């Protein structure tokens, strides 16, 4: 009786298993995320404050799938060499569905043992829950720039940072037009 279905279920063979993992991992890794009433709800989900717990898990699984859509187009094997360095002076390699890197990701407690673990879709999605759980809850908002500093998920993901990008405008549009949000 879900009202909102994540985009990875449309094409990905394991898409339903990904959703089941996210719904369960949200209980364990996103309890702070799911207690926030975000200050930019008027932008992302106008009716956020009336969502049940189950609807908020449906919402965050959808938003994660919309980020995956533009980060990796659902390709868990994807890697991308960035413009900047890790602390050792090697260019950062972003990996997997949400394009997380091992050094910055492991700072969230994601516990990646090796780079191969970032291409494990379940570990990758769990890490993205951890990142959101930290910053959406600390900043009290999903994204946006407040007094010259990016907030919420935009702290980590440039795909959530406002601008004239198809990715950002689509994530915003898809979120705010979910039946449970509008």
XYZ file of N, CA, C and O in Angstrom, residues 18 65-79 95-99 124 159:
92
model
N 16.592 -3.347 -3.285
C 17.173 -2.085 -2.835
C 16.197 -1.318 -1.954
O 16.589 -0.769 -0.924
N 16.508 7.707 -4.649
C 16.496 7.154 -6.007
C 16.619 8.248 -7.059
O 17.241 8.035 -8.103
N 16.073 9.435 -6.794
C 16.239 10.531 -7.738
C 17.684 11.020 -7.767
O 18.185 11.411 -8.827
N 18.381 10.985 -6.620
C 19.808 11.311 -6.614
C 20.610 10.252 -7.361
O 21.486 10.581 -8.166
N 20.340 8.970 -7.083
C 21.017 7.894 -7.805
C 20.806 8.063 -9.301
O 21.735 7.894 -10.099
N 19.582 8.424 -9.700
C 19.273 8.604 -11.117
C 20.256 9.543 -11.805
O 20.730 9.252 -12.912
N 20.597 10.666 -11.163
C 21.506 11.606 -11.801
C 22.964 11.381 -11.432
O 23.842 11.748 -12.219
N 23.244 10.757 -10.287
C 24.630 10.478 -9.920
C 25.211 9.346 -10.768
O 26.326 9.450 -11.291
N 24.484 8.241 -10.891
C 25.052 7.051 -11.504
C 24.145 6.402 -12.535
O 24.543 5.389 -13.118
N 22.946 6.945 -12.762
C 21.891 6.296 -13.536
C 21.756 4.830 -13.133
O 21.628 3.949 -13.990
N 21.805 4.566 -11.826
C 21.550 3.257 -11.229
C 22.637 2.228 -11.534
O 22.424 1.026 -11.334
N 23.814 2.667 -11.968
C 24.955 1.783 -12.236
C 25.856 1.710 -11.000
O 26.677 2.599 -10.769
N 25.706 0.636 -10.209
C 26.516 0.453 -9.004
C 28.011 0.358 -9.312
O 28.839 0.661 -8.443
N 28.380 -0.025 -10.538
C 29.790 -0.168 -10.876
C 30.460 1.156 -11.221
O 31.689 1.194 -11.347
N 29.707 2.244 -11.344
C 30.287 3.483 -11.841
C 31.336 4.048 -10.890
O 31.158 4.055 -9.673
N 32.438 4.526 -11.460
C 33.419 5.320 -10.740
C 33.734 6.564 -11.558
O 33.590 6.571 -12.785
N 32.310 6.654 -6.131
C 31.964 5.283 -6.480
C 30.498 4.977 -6.202
O 29.898 5.509 -5.260
N 29.935 4.100 -7.039
C 28.658 3.477 -6.758
C 27.453 4.357 -7.036
O 27.528 5.408 -7.674
N 26.315 3.908 -6.498
C 25.026 4.497 -6.858
C 24.972 5.984 -6.530
O 24.505 6.790 -7.342
N 25.426 6.367 -5.332
C 25.366 7.753 -4.879
C 26.674 8.511 -5.065
O 26.785 9.661 -4.606
N 27.666 7.894 -5.708
C 28.948 8.537 -6.000
C 29.582 9.089 -4.719
O 29.881 10.277 -4.581
N 26.403 1.141 -0.240
C 26.420 2.500 -0.767
C 25.187 3.271 -0.309
O 25.287 4.395 0.209
N 24.913 17.418 -6.507
C 23.644 17.250 -7.204
C 22.495 17.886 -6.430
O 21.468 18.230 -7.020
